[PDB]
Amino acid sequence: RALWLPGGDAPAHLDGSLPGDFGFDPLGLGADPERLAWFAESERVHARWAMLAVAGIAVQEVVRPDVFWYEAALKSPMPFGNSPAAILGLVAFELFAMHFVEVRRAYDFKNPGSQDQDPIFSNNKLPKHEVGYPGGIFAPVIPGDLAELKLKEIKNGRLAMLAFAGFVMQAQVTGKGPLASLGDHLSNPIGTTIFSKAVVIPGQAIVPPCMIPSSVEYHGITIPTPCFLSGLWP
Amino acid sequence: KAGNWLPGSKTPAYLEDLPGSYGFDPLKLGEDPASLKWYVQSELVHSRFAMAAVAGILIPEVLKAFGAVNLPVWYEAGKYAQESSPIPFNTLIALEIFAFNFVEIKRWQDFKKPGSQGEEGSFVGLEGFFKGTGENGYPGGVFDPLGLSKGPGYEAMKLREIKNGRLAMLAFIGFASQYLATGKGPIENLLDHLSNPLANNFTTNGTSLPAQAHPLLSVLKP
Amino acid sequence: GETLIPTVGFLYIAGWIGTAGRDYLIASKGEAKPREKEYIIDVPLALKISAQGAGWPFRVIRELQKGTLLEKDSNITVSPR
Amino acid sequence: MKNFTTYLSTAPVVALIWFTFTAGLLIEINRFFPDPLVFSF
Amino acid sequence: RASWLPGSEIPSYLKGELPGDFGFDPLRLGEDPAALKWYQQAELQNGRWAMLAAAGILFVDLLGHLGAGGPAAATPWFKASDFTYFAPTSTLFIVELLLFAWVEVRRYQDMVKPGSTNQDPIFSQYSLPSGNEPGYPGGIFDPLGYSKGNMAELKLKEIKNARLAMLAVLGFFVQAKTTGKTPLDSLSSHLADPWSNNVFGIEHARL
Amino acid sequence: DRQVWFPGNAPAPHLDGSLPGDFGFDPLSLGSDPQLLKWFQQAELVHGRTAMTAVAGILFPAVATKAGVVNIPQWYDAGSVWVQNNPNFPFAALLFIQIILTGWVETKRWLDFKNPGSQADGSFLGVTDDFKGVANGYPGGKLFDPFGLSRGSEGQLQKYQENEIKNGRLAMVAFLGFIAQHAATGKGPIDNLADHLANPTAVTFATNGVSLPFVH
Ligand code: CHL
Ligand SMILES: CC1=C[C@H](O)CC(C)(C)[C@H]1/C=C/C(C)=C/C=C/C(C)=C/C=C\C=C(C)\C=C/C=C(C)\C=C\C1=C(C)C[C@H](O)CC1(C)C
Q1: Would you call D39 and C40 a contact, using CB atoms and an 8 Å cutoff?
Q2: CB contact (8 A) between residue F29 and residue D1
Q3: Distance of alpha carbon A9 from its chain centroid, rounded?
Q4: What does the alpha-carbon distance between residue A101 and residue A49 come to, in Å, rounded to a whole number?
Q5: Distance of alpha carbon E102 from alpha carbon F81, whole angstroms
Q6: Which of A233, B137, D16, E133 has CB atoms 3.0–4.6 Å from B44's, for a disulfide?
């Protein structure tokens, strides 16, 4: 099968049944089978959340170039309530909704087929499916076969996870959005890479400062905004 | 057995069927069966005395904290009661000595011979009050007027009495030591701990950790 | 605090030491080589018995009431009178 | 190691360890609490 | 089988025998059958008194708001003890304690021995119907023919409304302690701006 | 046989190579008793894991301090700095909290050593399988090994055991070096490394001042 390192050997606990199985497990994290199933569900949900986040960051940077996505919570709209404390109501609503939907997903994982019935309307029922791939009303149209689409989903999700890590780290080291950093790299390719402004030799070390402030004052809360392991930066 | 006080330890075999037993006897005080019976009775008597005492301290203190009543605090309640007492101090002591001599001799005689205080001629006609339940430390009769020892939950109430008793004993010793170390009431100590639990505890009362025994207290300070 | 409380403290510690020694001797009496434990100390057993000497007055008073604290006069050697 | 610990369990070695502990405890008590004559605090 | 958490394990002692059995016992509080029977009786008693309390608190609250009541309904439910009546506070507690002593001793005598207290003590011809549950009496307590027509369904409605009323009365008690407001004032403040006037924000402003 | 600490010398006869990191090193024969050997194996594992955590928590803050990003105090001064910067948290209260928490976890570990699998009875909040213990000094389970790196394969477990014991011994030697370098230079370990990297021919133990007390 396609291996992350061609010519190498896949570990024995990765047979190739899972979508996107390229034999990449050098640490042996998935050698326990129930841990492998749990980590497959975790990879799927991480991939989908990172896909949505990367698409949202790109769109809301294209739509609003004057708003930093790192600082987008400070300038977020407030369509509900006339008070600055209306964020706690939105937090409560989000916590209730995500608790419901994630408990539904988790109990589908532990008990397969248990959460297939609509709790309100007993006629509505999801058809029988696999764990982590609900289908039914969640997938009204499937443009193609399931296995190739699953491979496409996991590949795009891994790319989006790497892209979100890049978005975060570039926001810390540049203080600016993704496509602006891409334009700065396109303007000066030789002098904008991480290898350009960061050099560590045994003599001395040059570490770029992070432009994000260490804290912000959000209605008298003083939210800490630490640069992610900035002392270990090159 | 209700459980194990030290999970993984080998609990003594003579504490297997006792109510409120967690196998806790590292000093082997109850290894002798007669000692075990005597200490079961002693733990029950201590438990019930501490139970009533902690009630009579805490419930007036909680009602005072809520503002319902204004009663003197427990460490000074002897002073204000004796000034308004029609019976002075010495005769109160003598009456308590007489009454407790009588009732504790009756309890002791029942411990030595179970059911003996309920036989004919044990009292002057009123021995039916104290027929006994045939159990060490559980008298019954007048002492169980509602008759809930005959109910199904008798064994659960025995476990509830013993555990609340141990909690009450620790609570009264806590009240005494907290007064002797801080000089204030128990609810005052609780509110001081709730206001600043890092700085208001036994490590800062100046008594529980003596300065001579702990020289690092005065050194490792701001 | 000059004599009476020191008297109580000393009597408690002395009864502790005596009861620990008695318990160690009685435990070593039941072994196959009782004299061996008297000069090669069973240190874990001695530490366990030594910690159990805190509750000496209860066990000692019970043994006094039970009659097991004292050996009978018929079992103790005496010289001809 | 068993034979060495058996030698440490002999009566003079146990006596040395125990009396070192007791003498040290008395010395450090009299150092931390100098001149104790009465049970008064 | 209906349950509080679908797809989760149900305790073995809850098999739908009890009315309103949704398998909800995470603490395993009722394990012995006698304790479970006592807790069933306690749930029924607390729920019925909570239904009465919820009705009595909601009726005064709209009467005071709309003015349809008198000056008595104008006072809050937690300040209703400061109102002056024909009798002082000491005597009313005593007479209600005596009447409750009689009623609840009759009920407890039924609980210990079913069918023991089923006859009128002064009228030998007036007796409750046989086969009476400890928590479900008959006769004069059901003057209308309501125990035909799915007795099982009506027990479920009773226990559902009882649980809702218990939660509502606890909400009354807690909202009076924190906000210091009548229940309708709290409902109007939540309906004023719900995203800032709820348990969050208010308790963060309290601090 | 296997590789030994002194090539040409036979390994200690009570060390048969079953334990991780067995190089036959016991010149004082302290591990002759198998029960005492299990006790000393738990001692070495606890010491090594504590040393590994401590050396990481000394080195990474000191590396970050050397780069100028933060001003975390050196390891020999952090208790003083914390006490001076936390007047509302007394030293005795912090020590009491540490002592009761460590006493709880270490008494559980001790009682598992005395009787293996005895903490698996569900007495602590219903925890049954996670407190059973895989081997002596290797608890495992879903709590202590949540990624399941010990439940996958046997050879992977032995490789990770060798990694753990060798890094633990290295960290213990490193902490000894931390103590000796602070006592000789009065500076942090990353400060010592930076001074050595700046000019290694003159920044040596022979030039600190206390390793060679003479003038020279
Ligand atoms: C549980 C018993 C008990 C305890 C702990 C206290 C404790 C206290 N009383 Mg109090 N009292 C007690 C019982 C009684 N007192 C009083 C009458 C007073 C007065 C009038 C005053 C106090 C005050 C005080 C406080 C002053 C300190 C003190 O006097 O130490 C006493 C400590 C003791 C331990 C007392 C001894 C109690 C004893 C052990 C009870 C049992 C003895 C039996 C003979 C049992 C013997 C063994 C049996 C098996 C044969 C202190 C909080 C006063 C204070 O606030 O002013 C500074 C105050 O003015 N008490 C009476 C009335 C007879 C009691 C009845 O038992
Ligand atoms: C050996 C051992 C064994 C095991 O082990 C256990 C043990 C415990 C340890 C031990 C045992 C023992 C024996 C039994 C003892 C007993 C005895 C005798 C008979 C007594 C008498 C007889 C006794 C009597 C006469 C006595 C005494 C009396 C007198 C007056 C006193 C006085 C006083 C006191 C109070 C104290 C103070 O301070 C002072 C004075 C003033 C001085």
Answers
A1: no
A2: yes
A3: 29
A4: 14
A5: 70
A6: B137
